[PDB]
Amino acid sequence: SFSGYLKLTDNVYIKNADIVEEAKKVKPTVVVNAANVYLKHGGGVAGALNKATNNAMQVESDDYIATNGPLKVGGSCVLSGHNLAKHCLHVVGPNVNKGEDIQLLKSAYENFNQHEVLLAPLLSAGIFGADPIHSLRVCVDTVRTNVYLAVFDKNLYDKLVSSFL
Numbered sequence: 102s103f104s105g106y107l108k109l110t111d112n113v114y115i116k117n118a119d120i121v122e123e124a125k126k127v128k129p130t131v132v133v134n135a136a137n138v139y140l141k142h143g144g145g146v147a148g149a150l151n152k153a154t155n156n157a158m159q160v161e162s163d164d165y166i167a168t169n170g171p172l173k174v175g176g177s178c179v180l181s182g183h184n185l186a187k188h189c190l191h192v193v194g195p196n197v198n199k200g201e202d203i204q205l206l207k208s209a210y211e212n213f214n215q216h217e218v219l220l221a222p223l224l225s226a227g228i229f230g231a232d233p234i235h236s237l238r239v240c241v242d243t244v245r246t247n248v249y250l251a252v253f254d255k256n257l258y259d260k261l262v263s264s265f266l
């Protein structure tokens with residue numbers, strides 16, 4: 102089970118941890134991937150989760166895209182969690198670096214409400230370019246199910262906790 106998390110609200114928890122390492126340890130029912138519409142897991146959380154699956158996540162994702170086409174920004178799909186989780190919920194937050202509507206971040210977090218408990222990163226944070234403090238605020242104000250947030254960067258984790266309202 103999840104350990105060492107700081108409780109932020111009734112249902113949101115946070116820990117300074119590598120989501121890949123957290124997933125291998127806990128083997129949650131759902132690990133959230135910070136996906137793009139093409140499910141091209143090149144970098145950030147997606148690249149790290151995919152590399153941990155020995156590229157099996159990318160092979161499965163390419164078959165999903167070949168069949169279904171790309172996801173919408175703000176959308177998601179449930180695929181296998183491979184050696185990391187029972188399932189991976191690939192969620193597409195807006196990539197601010199690609200000029201995408203930051204208002205789609207709430208729509209992206211709404212996908213989490215379809216799962217009772219999730220291990221997740223902050224959507225649109227990191228290489229997606231959004232303000233992680235804003236992402237945490239949207240997470241707490243949108244997600245009603247139990248979300249265990251893994252924040253890789255210690256300095257960002259401290260900033261998120263110390264500024265949390």
Ligand SMILES: c1ncc2c(n1)NCC2
Binds near residue numbers: 118120222
């Ligand atoms: C949480 N947030 C970001 C990352 C992570 N976990 N693993 C590597 C990049």
